[PDB]
Amino acid sequence: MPLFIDDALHRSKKYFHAHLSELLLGEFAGLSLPLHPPTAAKAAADIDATREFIRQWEGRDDVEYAIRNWSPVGLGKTEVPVRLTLNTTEELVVFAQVEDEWSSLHERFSQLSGFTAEVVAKHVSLWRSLSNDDLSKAVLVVDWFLKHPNSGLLKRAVAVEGVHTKWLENHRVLIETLVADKRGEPGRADLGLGDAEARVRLRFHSVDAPAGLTDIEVPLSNLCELQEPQVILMVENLDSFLALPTWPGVTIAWGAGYRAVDIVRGPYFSNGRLLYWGDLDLDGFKILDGVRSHVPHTESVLMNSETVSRWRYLGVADREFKAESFDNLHDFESDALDLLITDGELRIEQERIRLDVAVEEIEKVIRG
Amino acid sequence: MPLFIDDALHRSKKYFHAHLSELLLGEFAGLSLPLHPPTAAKAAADIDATREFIRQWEGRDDVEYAIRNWSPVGLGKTEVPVRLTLNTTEELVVFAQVEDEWSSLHERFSQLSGFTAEVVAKHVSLWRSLSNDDLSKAVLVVDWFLKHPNSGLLKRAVAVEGVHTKWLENHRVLIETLVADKRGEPGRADLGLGDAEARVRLRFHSVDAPAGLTDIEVPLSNLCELQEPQVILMVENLDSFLALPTWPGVTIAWGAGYRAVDIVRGPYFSNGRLLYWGDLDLDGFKILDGVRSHVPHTESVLMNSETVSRWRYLGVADREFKAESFDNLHDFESDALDLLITDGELRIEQERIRLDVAVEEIEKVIRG
């Protein structure tokens, strides 16, 4: 089919957008589009559209013309445009009508001349839409990450002017690439940003309270400053954790559900006898399994078929129950979870156990 | 209009439900419903419906009948039912067809005979739908609240079997009424339940860290176990609070927004020089005002027209701005809030201040 000038314009702009990387590198191979001039029969079938096709190309210096003999259809020998060829990037950009976009791209590109041009061009998609101020901030941030490698600092501790956390996160992939470039690392550099926040809550009896503080929440990293505990009681439910009294030599730990598995990776938790009390449901047993995966001498409390049998009348159906296998449960815990399964996937929350009964069973287990 | 038997049944049941309190008290005044027998003309216009009306009442001992003379319409003297009268609660309940509901209501009511019958009947709406087990638990809970007045304990510390927090809350108004009854208090008793709310977060320099713990979160009640601070830096935004370094003799406190006003009620906060750093918006200044309402020597940091003037280019419009007057701001803070107002209700979040600049201004203010 005949390629009209509007169609060539569209294809040229589409190609320009498809090869933005190469053009910024000066790697323009040229674009050649055949215009497919009408056959004699088509020229005779629609004389006016064929005239329009030819007229749209007349007088262009980048267009090849050829004489076709249409004498059999009464038009005689007529010169028709056959092919557009754009050899230079300037010809493409002026033809594709993208001069302002190209100038803005080169201006932004030139602001990035401190980095490898090849890498910049390959990821043009990351920066073509940024403001010049955003680019200047980006350069400043890259220098900051090069001067403070593995800072371990929170995203907020990047003290670069105009750089707030939401902005730094939004362009993060670009920053990682540019840090990799300056470091000579492939792809994306580790920024060495931190997250901190590894926290755990502990309660003490007044005789053991560090500096007399009987209820503290600390980062896991500070646990080495404490006296080693003889007994740790980890409690999943917070309300049960808070209602318990405190005992000499016993550190009470809040398990915070599944967070228990990450918490027990701290050496503090292996230095004592670890007792765990969770929910009587799938999730409590899965947390117990994960805890023993790091501290195998973990003893369960109130997570036995005897307690289940007593308190199942307050159980509700666990709505999310999916049979999962746990490798680190003892037989009596497999028996208790199976017992919860068969009564209709029961969940017996810790809060349904009478606090005094839980205290009595805990005291029995702790005393040995 | 003639009242058919179905309509009387409906009205009797509706009345029964409307006076449930009085019936349980034996205060049944009787129900009298006039049946409005047809006039001669209506009896003649619809002979069959009139026959049905009469037939539905025939043979009932509680129905008054009267002879109407319908001879002018060819029916002669005909006896017609004129009025239903139910004098006893049994007649009403059997007629209203609510025997099972009435028996269940009295059984539940008899379970409440330990309390004033009048009060129980007046609030029948609170208990008619409970199970007998829920009633037994309620009695046990009432005895618990009578034996532990002003316990200050959390809802979870109610160690009554089968009573969990969600259940105790769902029936709470009923429990308060019953405790009031046994206490001889009008209406609803204070249960004397607590909320054990507090929680302030503190960071220390390593030389001041209690037992070497440099980042702790404690209940406000534990603050008396700490050494009195020389300087407190309260920070509203958490990310700024965490990114700051720690200084000798300086305790950094997390203000947690509006929670700062309740936190500073602790004597710990008056024992030192209290510095506050909040957001540059309406909320930060309102928190500062509330803080000084308890600790008048509170000094603001970075909440001045100089800092505003420098960082306003990162401000955004505060969308919830409502002109509020604050009594405890100093003139330079009124000037800074007014400056935020006039540039279009700006919010300049703490995270937009360069961390090193905030550190420098904080260090200047702390050093004096």
Side-chain angles (χ1 to χ4, degrees), chain B residues 157-208:
Chain B
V158 182
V160 181
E161 192 166 3
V163 177
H164 53 74
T165 305
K166 295 185 177 183
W167 181 97
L168 182 62
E169 287 176 331
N170 290 349
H171 305 102
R172 186 174 178 200
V173 178
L174 178 61
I175 299 304
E176 288 176 336
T177 305
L178 293 178
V179 173
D181 179 59
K182 283 291 199 178
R183 291 183 182 168
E185 291 170 7
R188 291 186 201 170
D190 188 1
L191 303 182
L193 293 175
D195 314 306
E197 292 177 350
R199 245 67 77 204
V200 63
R201 198 176 190 179
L202 304 174
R203 284 176 72 217
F204 303 90
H205 188 265
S206 56
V207 304
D208 309 301

CSV table of all heavy atoms in Angstrom, one decimal, chain B residues 157-208:
chain,number,residue,atom,x,y,z
B,157,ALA,N,-7.9,-9.1,82.2
B,157,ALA,CA,-7.6,-9.6,83.5
B,157,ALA,C,-8.8,-10.1,84.2
B,157,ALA,O,-8.7,-10.7,85.3
B,157,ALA,CB,-6.9,-8.6,84.3
B,158,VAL,N,-10.0,-10.0,83.7
B,158,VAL,CA,-11.2,-10.6,84.2
B,158,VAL,C,-11.1,-12.2,84.1
B,158,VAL,O,-11.5,-12.7,83.1
B,158,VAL,CB,-12.5,-10.1,83.6
B,158,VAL,CG1,-13.7,-10.7,84.2
B,158,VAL,CG2,-12.6,-8.6,83.7
B,159,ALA,N,-10.6,-12.8,85.1
B,159,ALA,CA,-10.4,-14.3,85.1
B,159,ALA,C,-11.6,-15.1,85.5
B,159,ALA,O,-11.7,-15.8,86.4
B,159,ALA,CB,-9.2,-14.7,85.9
B,160,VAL,N,-12.7,-14.9,84.7
B,160,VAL,CA,-14.0,-15.6,84.8
B,160,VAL,C,-14.0,-16.6,83.7
B,160,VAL,O,-13.9,-16.2,82.5
B,160,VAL,CB,-15.2,-14.7,84.8
B,160,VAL,CG1,-16.5,-15.5,85.0
B,160,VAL,CG2,-15.0,-13.6,85.9
B,161,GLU,N,-14.3,-17.9,84.0
B,161,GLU,CA,-14.3,-18.9,83.0
B,161,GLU,C,-15.3,-18.7,81.9
B,161,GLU,O,-16.5,-18.3,82.2
B,161,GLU,CB,-14.5,-20.3,83.6
B,161,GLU,CG,-14.2,-21.4,82.7
B,161,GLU,CD,-14.1,-22.8,83.3
B,161,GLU,OE1,-14.3,-22.9,84.6
B,161,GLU,OE2,-13.8,-23.8,82.6
B,162,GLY,N,-14.9,-18.9,80.7
B,162,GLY,CA,-15.7,-18.7,79.5
B,162,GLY,C,-15.8,-17.2,79.1
B,162,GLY,O,-16.5,-16.9,78.1
B,163,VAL,N,-15.3,-16.3,79.9
B,163,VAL,CA,-15.4,-14.9,79.6
B,163,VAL,C,-14.1,-14.4,79.0
B,163,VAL,O,-13.1,-14.3,79.6
B,163,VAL,CB,-15.7,-14.1,80.9
B,163,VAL,CG1,-15.7,-12.6,80.6
B,163,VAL,CG2,-17.0,-14.6,81.5
B,164,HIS,N,-14.2,-14.1,77.7
B,164,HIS,CA,-13.1,-13.4,77.0
B,164,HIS,C,-13.5,-12.0,76.7
B,164,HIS,O,-14.7,-11.6,76.8
B,164,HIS,CB,-12.8,-14.2,75.7
B,164,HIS,CG,-13.9,-14.5,74.8
B,164,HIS,ND1,-14.6,-13.6,74.0
B,164,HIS,CD2,-14.6,-15.7,74.6
B,164,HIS,CE1,-15.6,-14.1,73.3
B,164,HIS,NE2,-15.6,-15.4,73.7
B,165,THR,N,-12.5,-11.2,76.3
B,165,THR,CA,-12.7,-9.7,76.2
B,165,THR,C,-13.9,-9.3,75.3
B,165,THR,O,-14.7,-8.4,75.6
B,165,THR,CB,-11.4,-9.1,75.8
B,165,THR,OG1,-10.4,-9.4,76.7
B,165,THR,CG2,-11.5,-7.6,75.7
B,166,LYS,N,-13.9,-9.9,74.1
B,166,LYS,CA,-15.0,-9.6,73.1
B,166,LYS,C,-16.4,-9.8,73.7
B,166,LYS,O,-17.3,-9.0,73.5
B,166,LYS,CB,-14.8,-10.3,71.8
B,166,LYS,CG,-13.5,-10.0,71.1
B,166,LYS,CD,-13.4,-10.7,69.8
B,166,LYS,CE,-12.2,-10.3,69.0
B,166,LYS,NZ,-12.2,-11.0,67.6
B,167,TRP,N,-16.5,-10.9,74.5
B,167,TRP,CA,-17.8,-11.2,75.1
B,167,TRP,C,-18.1,-10.2,76.2
B,167,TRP,O,-19.2,-9.7,76.3
B,167,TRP,CB,-17.8,-12.7,75.6
B,167,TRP,CG,-19.0,-13.1,76.3
B,167,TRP,CD1,-20.0,-13.8,75.7
B,167,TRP,CD2,-19.4,-12.9,77.6
B,167,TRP,NE1,-21.0,-14.1,76.6
B,167,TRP,CE2,-20.6,-13.6,77.8
B,167,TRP,CE3,-18.8,-12.3,78.7
B,167,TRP,CZ2,-21.3,-13.5,79.1
B,167,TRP,CZ3,-19.4,-12.3,80.0
B,167,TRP,CH2,-20.7,-12.9,80.1
B,168,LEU,N,-17.1,-9.9,77.0
B,168,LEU,CA,-17.4,-9.0,78.1
B,168,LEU,C,-17.7,-7.6,77.6
B,168,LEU,O,-18.6,-6.9,78.1
B,168,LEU,CB,-16.1,-8.9,79.0
B,168,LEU,CG,-16.0,-8.0,80.2
B,168,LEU,CD1,-17.0,-8.5,81.2
B,168,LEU,CD2,-14.6,-8.1,80.8
B,169,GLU,N,-17.1,-7.1,76.5
B,169,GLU,CA,-17.4,-5.9,75.9
B,169,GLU,C,-18.8,-5.9,75.3
B,169,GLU,O,-19.6,-4.9,75.4
B,169,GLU,CB,-16.4,-5.5,74.8
B,169,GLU,CG,-15.1,-5.0,75.4
B,169,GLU,CD,-14.0,-4.8,74.4
B,169,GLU,OE1,-14.1,-5.4,73.3
B,169,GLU,OE2,-13.1,-3.9,74.6
B,170,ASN,N,-19.2,-7.0,74.6
B,170,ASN,CA,-20.5,-7.0,73.9
B,170,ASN,C,-21.7,-6.9,74.9
B,170,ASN,O,-22.7,-6.3,74.5
B,170,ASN,CB,-20.6,-8.4,73.2
B,170,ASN,CG,-19.7,-8.4,72.0
B,170,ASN,OD1,-19.1,-7.5,71.6
B,170,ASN,ND2,-19.6,-9.6,71.4
B,171,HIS,N,-21.5,-7.3,76.1
B,171,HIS,CA,-22.6,-7.3,77.1
B,171,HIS,C,-22.3,-6.2,78.2
B,171,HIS,O,-23.0,-6.2,79.2
B,171,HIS,CB,-22.8,-8.6,77.8
B,171,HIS,CG,-23.1,-9.7,76.8
B,171,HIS,ND1,-22.1,-10.6,76.4
B,171,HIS,CD2,-24.2,-10.0,76.1
B,171,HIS,CE1,-22.6,-11.5,75.5
B,171,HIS,NE2,-23.9,-11.1,75.3
B,172,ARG,N,-21.3,-5.4,77.9
B,172,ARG,CA,-20.8,-4.4,79.0
B,172,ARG,C,-21.9,-3.6,79.6
B,172,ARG,O,-21.8,-3.4,80.8
B,172,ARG,CB,-19.7,-3.6,78.3
B,172,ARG,CG,-19.0,-2.7,79.3
B,172,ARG,CD,-17.8,-1.9,78.7
B,172,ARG,NE,-17.1,-1.0,79.7
B,172,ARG,CZ,-16.4,0.0,79.3
B,172,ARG,NH1,-16.0,0.2,78.1
B,172,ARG,NH2,-15.9,0.8,80.3
B,173,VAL,N,-22.8,-3.0,78.8
B,173,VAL,CA,-23.8,-2.1,79.4
B,173,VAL,C,-24.7,-2.9,80.4
B,173,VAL,O,-25.0,-2.4,81.4
B,173,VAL,CB,-24.7,-1.5,78.2
B,173,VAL,CG1,-25.8,-0.7,78.8
B,173,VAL,CG2,-23.8,-0.7,77.3
B,174,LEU,N,-25.0,-4.2,80.0
B,174,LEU,CA,-25.7,-5.0,80.9
B,174,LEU,C,-25.0,-5.2,82.2
B,174,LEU,O,-25.6,-5.2,83.3
B,174,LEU,CB,-26.0,-6.3,80.2
B,174,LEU,CG,-26.8,-7.5,80.9
B,174,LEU,CD1,-28.2,-7.1,81.3
B,174,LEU,CD2,-26.8,-8.7,79.9
B,175,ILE,N,-23.7,-5.5,82.1
B,175,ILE,CA,-22.8,-5.7,83.3
B,175,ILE,C,-22.8,-4.5,84.2
B,175,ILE,O,-22.9,-4.6,85.4
B,175,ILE,CB,-21.4,-6.2,82.9
B,175,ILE,CG1,-21.5,-7.5,82.1
B,175,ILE,CG2,-20.5,-6.3,84.1
B,175,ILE,CD1,-22.2,-8.6,82.9
B,176,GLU,N,-22.6,-3.3,83.6
B,176,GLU,CA,-22.6,-2.1,84.3
B,176,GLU,C,-23.9,-1.9,85.1
B,176,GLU,O,-23.9,-1.5,86.2
B,176,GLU,CB,-22.3,-0.9,83.4
B,176,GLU,CG,-20.9,-0.8,82.9
B,176,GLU,CD,-20.6,0.3,81.9
B,176,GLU,OE1,-21.6,0.7,81.2
B,176,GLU,OE2,-19.5,0.8,81.8
B,177,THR,N,-25.0,-2.2,84.4
B,177,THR,CA,-26.3,-2.0,85.1
B,177,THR,C,-26.5,-3.0,86.3
B,177,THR,O,-26.9,-2.6,87.3
B,177,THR,CB,-27.5,-2.2,84.1
B,177,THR,OG1,-27.3,-1.4,83.0
B,177,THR,CG2,-28.8,-2.0,84.7
B,178,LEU,N,-26.0,-4.2,86.1
B,178,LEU,CA,-26.2,-5.2,87.2
B,178,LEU,C,-25.2,-4.9,88.3
B,178,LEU,O,-25.6,-5.1,89.5
B,178,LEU,CB,-25.9,-6.6,86.6
B,178,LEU,CG,-27.0,-7.0,85.6
B,178,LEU,CD1,-26.7,-8.4,85.0
B,178,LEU,CD2,-28.4,-7.0,86.3
B,179,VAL,N,-24.0,-4.4,88.1
B,179,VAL,CA,-23.1,-4.0,89.1
B,179,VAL,C,-23.7,-2.8,89.9
B,179,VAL,O,-23.6,-2.7,91.1
B,179,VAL,CB,-21.7,-3.6,88.5
B,179,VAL,CG1,-20.9,-3.0,89.6
B,179,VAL,CG2,-21.1,-4.9,88.0
B,180,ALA,N,-24.3,-1.8,89.1
B,180,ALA,CA,-25.0,-0.7,89.8
B,180,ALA,C,-26.1,-1.2,90.7
B,180,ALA,O,-26.2,-0.8,91.9
B,180,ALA,CB,-25.6,0.2,88.7
B,181,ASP,N,-26.9,-2.2,90.2
B,181,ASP,CA,-28.0,-2.8,91.1
B,181,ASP,C,-27.4,-3.3,92.4
B,181,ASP,O,-27.9,-3.0,93.5
B,181,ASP,CB,-28.7,-3.9,90.3
B,181,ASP,CG,-29.8,-4.5,91.1
B,181,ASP,OD1,-30.7,-3.8,91.6
B,181,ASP,OD2,-29.7,-5.7,91.3
B,182,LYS,N,-26.4,-4.2,92.3
B,182,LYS,CA,-25.9,-4.8,93.5
B,182,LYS,C,-25.2,-3.7,94.4
B,182,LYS,O,-25.1,-3.9,95.6
B,182,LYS,CB,-24.9,-5.9,93.2
B,182,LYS,CG,-25.6,-7.2,92.8
B,182,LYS,CD,-26.3,-7.8,94.0
B,182,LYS,CE,-26.6,-9.3,93.8
B,182,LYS,NZ,-27.3,-9.9,95.0
B,183,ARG,N,-24.7,-2.7,93.8
B,183,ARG,CA,-24.0,-1.6,94.6
B,183,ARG,C,-25.0,-0.6,95.1
B,183,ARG,O,-24.6,0.3,95.9
B,183,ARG,CB,-22.9,-0.9,93.7
B,183,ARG,CG,-21.7,-1.7,93.4
B,183,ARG,CD,-20.7,-0.9,92.7
B,183,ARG,NE,-19.5,-1.7,92.3
B,183,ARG,CZ,-18.6,-1.3,91.5
B,183,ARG,NH1,-18.6,-0.1,90.9
B,183,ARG,NH2,-17.5,-2.1,91.2
B,184,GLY,N,-26.3,-0.6,94.6
B,184,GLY,CA,-27.2,0.4,95.0
B,184,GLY,C,-26.9,1.7,94.3
B,184,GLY,O,-27.4,2.8,94.9
B,185,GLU,N,-26.2,1.8,93.2
B,185,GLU,CA,-25.9,2.9,92.4
B,185,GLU,C,-27.0,3.1,91.3
B,185,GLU,O,-27.4,2.1,90.7
B,185,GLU,CB,-24.5,2.9,91.8
B,185,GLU,CG,-23.4,2.9,92.9
B,185,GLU,CD,-22.1,2.6,92.3
B,185,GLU,OE1,-21.9,2.5,91.1
B,185,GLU,OE2,-21.1,2.5,93.1
B,186,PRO,N,-27.3,4.3,91.0
B,186,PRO,CA,-28.3,4.6,89.9
B,186,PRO,C,-27.7,4.3,88.5
B,186,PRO,O,-26.6,4.7,88.2
B,186,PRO,CB,-28.7,6.0,90.1
B,186,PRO,CG,-27.5,6.7,90.6
B,186,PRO,CD,-26.9,5.6,91.5
B,187,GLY,N,-28.5,3.6,87.7
B,187,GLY,CA,-28.1,3.5,86.3
B,187,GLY,C,-27.0,2.5,86.0
B,187,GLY,O,-27.2,1.3,86.2
B,188,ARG,N,-25.8,3.0,85.7
B,188,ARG,CA,-24.7,2.1,85.3
B,188,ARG,C,-23.6,2.4,86.3
B,188,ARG,O,-23.2,3.6,86.5
B,188,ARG,CB,-24.2,2.4,83.9
B,188,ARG,CG,-25.1,1.9,82.8
B,188,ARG,CD,-24.4,2.1,81.5
B,188,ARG,NE,-25.2,2.3,80.3
B,188,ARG,CZ,-24.8,2.6,79.1
B,188,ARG,NH1,-23.5,2.8,78.9
B,188,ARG,NH2,-25.6,2.7,78.1
B,189,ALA,N,-23.0,1.3,86.9
B,189,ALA,CA,-21.8,1.5,87.7
B,189,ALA,C,-20.6,1.6,86.9
B,189,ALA,O,-20.5,1.1,85.8
B,189,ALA,CB,-21.7,0.2,88.6
B,190,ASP,N,-19.6,2.4,87.4
B,190,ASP,CA,-18.3,2.3,86.9
B,190,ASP,C,-17.7,0.9,87.3
B,190,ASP,O,-17.7,0.6,88.4
B,190,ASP,CB,-17.4,3.4,87.5
B,190,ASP,CG,-16.0,3.5,86.8
B,190,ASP,OD1,-15.7,2.7,85.9
B,190,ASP,OD2,-15.2,4.3,87.2
B,191,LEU,N,-17.3,0.2,86.3
B,191,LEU,CA,-16.7,-1.1,86.5
B,191,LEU,C,-15.3,-1.0,87.1
B,191,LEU,O,-14.8,-2.0,87.6
B,191,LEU,CB,-16.6,-1.9,85.1
B,191,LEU,CG,-17.9,-2.0,84.4
B,191,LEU,CD1,-17.7,-2.8,83.1
B,191,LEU,CD2,-19.0,-2.7,85.3
B,192,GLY,N,-14.6,0.1,87.0
B,192,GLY,CA,-13.3,0.3,87.5
B,192,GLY,C,-12.3,-0.6,86.7
B,192,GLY,O,-11.3,-1.0,87.3
B,193,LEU,N,-12.6,-0.8,85.4
B,193,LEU,CA,-11.6,-1.4,84.5
B,193,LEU,C,-10.6,-0.3,84.0
B,193,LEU,O,-11.0,0.9,83.9
B,193,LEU,CB,-12.4,-2.0,83.3
B,193,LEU,CG,-13.3,-3.1,83.5
B,193,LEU,CD1,-14.0,-3.5,82.2
B,193,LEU,CD2,-12.5,-4.3,83.9
B,194,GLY,N,-9.4,-0.8,83.8
B,194,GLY,CA,-8.4,0.1,83.3
B,194,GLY,C,-8.1,-0.1,81.8
B,194,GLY,O,-8.7,-0.9,81.1
B,195,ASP,N,-7.1,0.7,81.4
B,195,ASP,CA,-6.7,0.7,80.0
B,195,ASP,C,-5.1,0.6,79.9
B,195,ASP,O,-4.6,0.3,78.8
B,195,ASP,CB,-7.2,1.9,79.2
B,195,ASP,CG,-8.7,2.1,79.4
B,195,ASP,OD1,-9.5,1.1,79.3
B,195,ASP,OD2,-9.1,3.2,79.8
B,196,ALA,N,-4.4,0.8,81.0
B,196,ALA,CA,-3.0,0.6,81.1
B,196,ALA,C,-2.3,1.1,79.9
B,196,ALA,O,-1.5,0.4,79.2
B,196,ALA,CB,-2.6,-0.8,81.5
B,197,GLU,N,-2.6,2.4,79.6
B,197,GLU,CA,-2.0,3.1,78.4
B,197,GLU,C,-0.9,4.0,78.9
B,197,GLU,O,-0.9,4.5,80.0
B,197,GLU,CB,-3.1,4.0,77.7
B,197,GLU,CG,-4.2,3.2,77.0
B,197,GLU,CD,-5.2,4.1,76.5
B,197,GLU,OE1,-5.2,5.3,76.8
B,197,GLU,OE2,-6.1,3.7,75.7
B,198,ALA,N,0.1,4.1,78.0
B,198,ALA,CA,1.3,4.9,78.4
B,198,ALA,C,2.3,4.9,77.2
B,198,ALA,O,2.0,5.6,76.2
B,198,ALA,CB,2.0,4.3,79.6
B,199,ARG,N,3.3,4.1,77.3
B,199,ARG,CA,4.3,4.0,76.2
B,199,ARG,C,5.0,5.2,75.5
B,199,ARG,O,4.4,5.9,74.8
B,199,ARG,CB,3.8,3.1,75.0
B,199,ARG,CG,4.7,1.9,74.9
B,199,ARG,CD,4.6,1.0,76.1
B,199,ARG,NE,3.4,0.2,75.9
B,199,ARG,CZ,2.8,-0.4,77.0
B,199,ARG,NH1,3.3,-0.3,78.2
B,199,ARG,NH2,1.8,-1.1,76.8
B,200,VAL,N,6.1,5.6,76.1
B,200,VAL,CA,7.0,6.6,75.6
B,200,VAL,C,8.3,5.9,75.1
B,200,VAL,O,8.8,5.0,75.7
B,200,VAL,CB,7.3,7.7,76.6
B,200,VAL,CG1,8.0,7.1,77.8
B,200,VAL,CG2,8.0,8.8,75.9
B,201,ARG,N,8.8,6.4,73.9
B,201,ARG,CA,10.0,5.9,73.4
B,201,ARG,C,11.2,6.8,73.6
B,201,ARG,O,11.1,8.0,73.3
B,201,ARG,CB,9.9,5.7,71.9
B,201,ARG,CG,10.9,4.8,71.3
B,201,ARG,CD,10.8,4.5,69.9
B,201,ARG,NE,11.7,3.5,69.6
B,201,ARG,CZ,11.9,2.9,68.5
B,201,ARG,NH1,11.3,3.2,67.4
B,201,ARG,NH2,12.7,1.8,68.5
B,202,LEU,N,12.3,6.3,74.1
B,202,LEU,CA,13.5,7.1,74.5
B,202,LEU,C,14.8,6.5,73.9
B,202,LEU,O,15.0,5.3,73.8
B,202,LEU,CB,13.7,7.2,76.0
B,202,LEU,CG,12.4,7.7,76.7
B,202,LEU,CD1,12.6,7.7,78.2
B,202,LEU,CD2,12.2,9.2,76.3
B,203,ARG,N,15.7,7.4,73.4
B,203,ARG,CA,17.0,7.0,73.0
B,203,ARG,C,18.1,7.8,73.8
B,203,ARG,O,17.9,8.9,74.2
B,203,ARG,CB,17.3,7.3,71.5
B,203,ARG,CG,16.6,6.3,70.6
B,203,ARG,CD,16.8,6.7,69.1
B,203,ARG,NE,18.2,6.5,68.7
B,203,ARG,CZ,18.8,7.3,67.9
B,203,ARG,NH1,18.2,8.4,67.3
B,203,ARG,NH2,20.1,7.1,67.5
B,204,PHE,N,19.2,7.1,74.1
B,204,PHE,CA,20.2,7.6,75.0
B,204,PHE,C,21.6,7.5,74.2
B,204,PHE,O,21.8,6.6,73.4
B,204,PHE,CB,20.3,6.8,76.3
B,204,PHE,CG,19.1,6.8,77.1
B,204,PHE,CD1,18.1,5.8,76.9
B,204,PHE,CD2,18.8,7.8,78.0
B,204,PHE,CE1,17.0,5.8,77.6
B,204,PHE,CE2,17.7,7.8,78.8
B,204,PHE,CZ,16.7,6.8,78.6
B,205,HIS,N,22.5,8.4,74.6
B,205,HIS,CA,23.9,8.2,74.3
B,205,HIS,C,24.4,7.0,75.1
B,205,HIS,O,24.0,6.7,76.2
B,205,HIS,CB,24.7,9.4,74.5
B,205,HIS,CG,26.1,9.4,74.1
B,205,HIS,ND1,27.2,9.0,74.9
B,205,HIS,CD2,26.7,9.6,72.9
B,205,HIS,CE1,28.3,9.0,74.2
B,205,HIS,NE2,28.0,9.4,73.0
B,206,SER,N,25.4,6.3,74.5
B,206,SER,CA,25.9,5.1,75.1
B,206,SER,C,26.5,5.3,76.6
B,206,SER,O,26.5,4.4,77.3
B,206,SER,CB,27.0,4.5,74.3
B,206,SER,OG,28.1,5.4,74.0
B,207,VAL,N,26.9,6.5,76.9
B,207,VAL,CA,27.3,6.8,78.3
B,207,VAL,C,26.2,6.9,79.3
B,207,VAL,O,26.4,6.7,80.5
B,207,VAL,CB,28.2,8.0,78.4
B,207,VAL,CG1,29.3,8.0,77.4
B,207,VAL,CG2,27.3,9.3,78.1
B,208,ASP,N,25.0,7.1,78.8
B,208,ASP,CA,23.8,7.3,79.7
B,208,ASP,C,22.9,6.1,79.6
B,208,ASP,O,21.9,6.1,80.4
B,208,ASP,CB,23.1,8.6,79.4
B,208,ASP,CG,24.0,9.8,79.3
B,208,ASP,OD1,24.6,10.1,80.3
B,208,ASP,OD2,24.0,10.4,78.2
